Amino acid sequence: SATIKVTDASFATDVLSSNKPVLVDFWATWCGPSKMVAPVLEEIATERATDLTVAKLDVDTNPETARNFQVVSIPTLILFKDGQPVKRIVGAKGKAALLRELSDVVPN
Numbered sequence: 001s002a003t004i005k006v007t008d009a010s011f012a013t014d015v016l017s018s019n020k021p022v023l024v025d026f027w028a029t030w031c032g033p034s035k036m037v038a039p040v041l042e043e044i045a046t047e048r049a050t051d052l053t054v055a056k057l058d059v060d061t062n063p064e065t066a067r068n069f070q071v072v073s074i075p076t077l078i079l080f081k082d083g084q085p086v087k088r089i090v091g092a093k094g095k096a097a098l099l100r101e102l103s104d105v106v107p108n
């Protein structure tokens with residue numbers, strides 16, 4: 001997987017301080033509908049690798065990070081730019097739709 005896995009511990013280096021925008025997928029190990037977005041994210045990570053990084057955070061095992069960023073529904077996607085959560089996406093989408101939301105902030 002072109003996507004990366006992040007934790008509470010790794011979040012600051014992996015996501016926050018990244019000079020490249022990161023799309024973070026807040027998901028649950030025990031939620032099946034929350035895993036539906038994974039393949040699409042995988043396609044995106046490979047296809048748009050120069051423009052964007054894709055990260056996956058398991059809210060089940062990293063509760064504080066999920067709470068700090070105020071994730072209320074799963075799956076949730078938050079785009080991080082220069083350390084800030086600049087974009088929040090709820091309701092799982094198709095690829096074209098997801099890419100359209102992201103284009104406002106990401107080139108290509």
Ligand SMILES: *C1=CC(=O)C=C[C@]1(O)c1nc2ccccc2s1
Pocket residue numbers: 030031032033034074075
């Ligand atoms: C709720 C209950 C469940 O059994 C699986 C995970 C969940 O948190 C979610 N359910 C849905 C259903 C539709 C879309 C998204 C989610 S998350």
